[PDB]
Amino acid sequence: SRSYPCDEKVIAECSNRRLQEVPQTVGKYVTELDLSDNFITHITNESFQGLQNLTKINLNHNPNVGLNITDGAFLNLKNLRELLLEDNQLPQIPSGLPESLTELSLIQNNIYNITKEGISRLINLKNLYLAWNCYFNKVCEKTNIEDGVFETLTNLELLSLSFNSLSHVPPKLPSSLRKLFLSNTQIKYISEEDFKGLINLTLLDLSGNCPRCFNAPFPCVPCDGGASINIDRFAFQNLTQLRYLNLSSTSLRKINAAWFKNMPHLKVLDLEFNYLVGEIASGAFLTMLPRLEILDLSFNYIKGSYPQHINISRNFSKLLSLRALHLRGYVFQELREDDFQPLMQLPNLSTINLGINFIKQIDFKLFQNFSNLEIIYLSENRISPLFEFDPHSNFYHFTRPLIKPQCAAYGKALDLSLNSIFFIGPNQFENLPDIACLNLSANSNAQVLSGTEFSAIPHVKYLDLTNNRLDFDNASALTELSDLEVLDLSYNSHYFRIAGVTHHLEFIQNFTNLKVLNLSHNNIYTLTDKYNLESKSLVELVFSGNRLDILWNDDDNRYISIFKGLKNLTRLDLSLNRLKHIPNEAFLNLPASLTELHINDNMLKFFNWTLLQQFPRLELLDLRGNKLLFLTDSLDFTSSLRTLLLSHNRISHLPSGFLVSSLKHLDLSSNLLKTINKSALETKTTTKLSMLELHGNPFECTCDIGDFRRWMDEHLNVKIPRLVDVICASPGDQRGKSIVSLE
């Protein structure tokens, strides 16, 4: 049958549905139940009375804008393995939890007391998350950890107590632990006893203890006098399995090399937001990490200091397994070749990260002297022409890839974005490696590209030129990049805005391998001499955020064939072009090779459906966010349409038998359908419709809805998502309830 209120694929997706109590209509065979972001206020032993096969329960953020849990409310669920109770304003750990629990997360509550009565019986616990309960300027209490409360959990592998006021590492920790998170715990001193027996530990996070608070984007409290964290010389002597060490924001001025004497597997060392400029120049500890792969030393700048060069110790040459060196926020003016000599013979160093250093000039000749550089990240510098925090993410840096993977996959990547290379000189890219991926976005480049600017790096396959002010006055622009496959020219509207200047786009045709071209948000409304775009290779063209409403206006025919010359085109995005109307000849001149057409977010008051006959490969047609009022009677016009997106229009009536042929996905949500008559379901053929979206329609829940209700019951192969949002607008006794909950 059709599940309600949840969607059961056995997991029951039942989140964000404005539920006020645990639904009693959940299938008795569900394995995992996700009830997050609902308005649930109480949990008793009757709430999950019929779901004894439950292993995972998600009750995060309830009620959405506290959660009362009775003692033993979960006790009857003897298969409950994972219980997520985040953002519930819980004042205590819930009493009488099932001993079958292996993962429990109480992140972001008001729990200031970790008691034996609450935790010391869940001896099967492997992951325990208690982070973010008392932090910053929250009015809260210092965390009380009963002596030996974790001593019972002999199978505990992960313990997270970060962002609580602990002041001391808890004693009597089980030696089964592999990951210990103690970030922002006000722990000023690490004794020799604190981790004496954790011989299985692979991760240790002591970040944010005695923090560096200058320019902190959060309420920050330094240790007395901004002193360093006090780590005993033998505090790590038995952590021989450690792979991850996070010492970010611990006010370190000196790194004791003896910390790593017995740490042969250390792979990632985080040292952000310290005062390690002197250690970077000396680096006695660097001798001890020949297996280290990632070293983050970012934001160690000295306040008010803008040195001429970066001082990299020669001992960086001992990091023989280094693959990624992160040196953001060191702040220096010039990168000379000899400054990076200690790094030039590392065999696996493929990522160098020098973002946000206010570097004025770089001798790009030095990057060729490297063994295996794959990612050169120089974004956000000063190079000139030649609750607030996600508790489940990294706190001191974003974890997204430095360069988009679609660009980095082509080969070596150079990122010069967010600088002020406002024009490319003739020798800007001399003595560089064979760059395949180049990011020059947001440089305010206003120059006329002619066909020589990228001659020194002619093998670029993916070129990012977004957010500039490029001046297209040469038909030979970018033609020296004959192997170019992806070109991004989004947000270059500066000169396209001005009618009096020339706009030449003819260079598009001089490419044999160009596949992806993005001209979005350029305000294109006039072109010079050649009015048509032409390419025999181009596969995808993104033309959103332009003025096709002007290019195709009724008193102008020069642009009637603007896209016809894109003979290989399969994907075309015409969204956000302010189109109230598409001339029939202009639509008929779109490439017949199209398989995907987006005309969403315009102002289309009418769509000529019969013209679809000239597009036998059209699988996807996107017309969401328009003002369409009518559908065609005999959709005779296509045998290829698999997806029809029509949400946010003004359709008030559905044609007879519309629910067609190869249509598998039909989106009619957010329209003006009051009902779906029996005429629309009087289909001859057997339907292949697998998803039909109808939420947001002002359905009239009288007796006339019964014919469509039975159609739903007959076709359970047609998945109707968000049935809780397919809501009756009429009559008053049904306004607010789902159409599936009537007589």
Next chain:
Amino acid sequence: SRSYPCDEKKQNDSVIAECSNRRLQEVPQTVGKYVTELDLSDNFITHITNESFQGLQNLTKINLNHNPNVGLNITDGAFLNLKNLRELLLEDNQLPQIPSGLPESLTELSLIQNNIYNITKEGISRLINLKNLYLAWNCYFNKVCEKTNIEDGVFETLTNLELLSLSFNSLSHVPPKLPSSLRKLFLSNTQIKYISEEDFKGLINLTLLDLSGNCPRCFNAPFPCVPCDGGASINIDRFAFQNLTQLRYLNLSSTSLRKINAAWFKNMPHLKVLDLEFNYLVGEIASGAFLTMLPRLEILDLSFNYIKGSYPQHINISRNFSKLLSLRALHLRGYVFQELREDDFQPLMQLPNLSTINLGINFIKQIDFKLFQNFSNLEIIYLSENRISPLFEFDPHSNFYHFTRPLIKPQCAAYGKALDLSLNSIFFIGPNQFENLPDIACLNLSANSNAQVLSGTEFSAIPHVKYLDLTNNRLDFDNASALTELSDLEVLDLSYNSHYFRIAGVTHHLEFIQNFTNLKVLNLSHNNIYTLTDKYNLESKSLVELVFSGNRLDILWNDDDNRYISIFKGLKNLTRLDLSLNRLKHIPNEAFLNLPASLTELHINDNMLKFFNWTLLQQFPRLELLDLRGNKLLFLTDSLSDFTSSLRTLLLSHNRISHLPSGFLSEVSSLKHLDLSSNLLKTINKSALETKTTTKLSMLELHGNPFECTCDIGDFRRWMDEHLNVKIPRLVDVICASPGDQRGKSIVSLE
């Protein structure tokens, strides 16, 4: 006595009825019988007949433009029942012909943007009182049209015609037999290749002649452009303007002129404005004998005369330019040249009244700024949109070849000499960028991608700037002495400088605001401010208006952080504060109580507020305007009168208020303007309509509410009847939503 469907206003004892854009299908017969001016524009009216305007005889002007909205059938003599109509507006109506039977009373008739290709004598020659006749934009561009047939001598009868505009129709020749009463003649884009002597021989009182767009310059045209055979110039004879002694405006833009006959201007010594845009006059600008024949010329526009494919080192200005002693503004856009030296503008430096020089869109790379000091009195130096580096889609009522907007915003130019360097690439300001400059009072450095750390010495050479535009840059605020050398600075615009503000790891210092004694207006909008360094408060004993829209007060006033709780309190003189577009889901009670008590205007619109602590208004005794539009407010307070004695305007549109609290229109007798439009009000019952008191409530907006139009409405309906002093705008949109018998229907339309 409340009007419907039109809004009947009053203007110097005249009666206007504003009835535009109301989805009307027929001309309403409920207008007042005293109305003199009726605006029925932008409706869905399809027919105009004998009976469409019965009994409305003081009617002097009618606006039927844009009908129907997204043709208009006018029957013969549908107006002649009138006796006083002087102005008839019939624009954009798809009329196939000039309507027949229009009254002899017409002094102005506008037929712009129709399908009229036949100017017959039946239609126009009977209207002896016509002063202005508009027929432009009927066959133009690639529109499927017909050539304009002008019946010979049809304008011969209108001996009172002062304005005739036939622009953007295919005329081929200047119409013969024009009445000598003509003072303005528009023949733009009319495919008139030749101007003979008989063409304007009899119009001795003409003050403007528009011949633009004939034999046009078609390169880079933003419209379908058809040049004369071989790109030839327009052919105007030597004596074509000999009898035009009263001409003050001459438009010859886009006529592909290569040479100008100086004798054309011999007998027009009063010519004030000469438009020569979009031609090929680079040679005439350097030689130019005609420049000696314009002694009273005040405005000379030579823009976009560039030679295609040419990028000369310097601009070549004839020394005969010094003969333009009455010149006030020189527009030299689109000349395209690399360098501006002081020797190149010597012919201009002795003109007494030259105040505006416009050099935009020239791709100038270097300018010797010392040349502007030698000018007698330059007030506007427009150098926007160049390449300086560190040292229907056309409005038928606007100019077709340039925008008529002021070059500098008037609020800036009012302070004195203005220098516009916007839209260049001055990405940092060197120690001598502004040396040898005049006493600049108004400086526009916007959109230069400037990433400099201002530190107090960048503007020393021009220390009397009162209005500084630094918008759309990437400024780096790491110095507390930034801009402090501009001691007289009164307006500082720092909009759209979010580049470094969004990076949490770099510093953001805003302490320099306090060092100004005369700063009145500060705009920090759309900067994404959410973290500051060291000092968390904005302080100024002079600041009057702070625009803080488009920032992140939702993060700054986060519940787990109190550092920014008094961010605005140190603005002791602040009277206007804009906190819109800050994604606020709630304001902490202590945060609102720390807003400056001197506030009279507070904007918190377009956020996400679901609750508002109305009690806190007790601490703002001068608050006159509270703008809470575009939020998610669910309730109103029982006790607004107990919380404020000063609030005059309360804007609450686009919220979720479904109930009006009892006694909401009495008691509060400082409130003149209450906006409850686009809310969730289903009814307003008698209890909220109590009036104890004085009630200064004058305006009450309610359109967009889903009104329950049963008999419960009846009491609010009769509250409207008994309170005509309360204007309720747009009754057409105060619409019943239920039941279906009255849906889509205005609430005054009911028994």
